[PDB]
Ligand SMILES: CCc1cncnc1N1CCN(Cc2nc3cc(C(F)(F)F)ccc3[nH]2)CC1
């Protein structure tokens with residue numbers, strides 16, 4: 272019978288308006304001593320909002336259904352009279368964002384590795400009719416070995432909440448597709464845009480469309496006049512041009528082949544997809560080894 276007293280609170284990993292994420296230690300039952308991450312959501316801050324209650328139920332359902340090496344695992348889920356609990360696998364490798372901050376710019380082979388693993392998580396989700404929608408570096412974590420882990424499937428993590436309509440404008444919009452920003456309707460092609468923005472950020476040190484303020488940034492994304500730096504490889508530039516297109520339906524990955532279309536691009540010519548999925552490829556960075 273899984274209950275809050277089954278877990279010892281160790282430390283706070285994140286604090287938002289909707290609740291906290293803890294590192295926890297299981298203290299009862301078979302797994303005694305096992306370390307997990309625990310997300311604790313404030314019911315009363317959710318129960319009033321309609322789209323927030325829906326999103327809370329969706330995260331629960333997605334994570335329980337999905338089993339994939341590059342997507343964070345849900346272990347337990349339970350409720351009390353005021354809190355929702357999610358017990359997820361503890362991931363010790365930090366955020367992808369931290370590795371990018373350390374390095375400034377990734378070498379092509381480094382970027383290629385992360386983008387390739389991401390393309391597989393993305394492909395798996397699309398098979399199940401799930402859309403990720405924001406591939407900003409802070410949404411991607413690394414496991415203890417340094418392999419990719421997609422992890423934001425639930426409520427906005429912020430404390431302030433830009434307006435009270437949606438949660439699009441609460442964090443950075445620098446990796447979101449134009450059609451998300453316009454709310455004109457969208458589909459899985461949004462994830463391939465976003466993979467392109469993350470790629471551009473990895474290879475140049477900054478996202479493709481950044482302005483002084485939020486309005487100028489939005490305007491740059493909608494205009495979608497891509498500036499390809501001339502020192503990227505021919506392969507990297509060709510993939511970026513194909514991912515970062517205003518017209519969603521013409522992006523690489525947007526057709527019937529989905530991840531298959533992106534994976535067949537020459538930028539990924541040195542990737543063995545069976546060995547990658549099996550995690551037999553050594554990551555460029557091993558967080559346990561880092562200082
Ligand atoms: C649970 C997956 C994970 C696994 N292992 C180690 N670290 C992890 N995370 C992944 C998520 N990450 C960012 C974060 N998400 C948040 C969600 C909230 C919410 F309560 F929903 F509002 C609050 C603060 C939050 N901070 C914190 C550490």
Ligand SMILES: [Zn+2]
Pocket residue numbers: 427428429431432433437438441
């Ligand atoms: Zn928000």
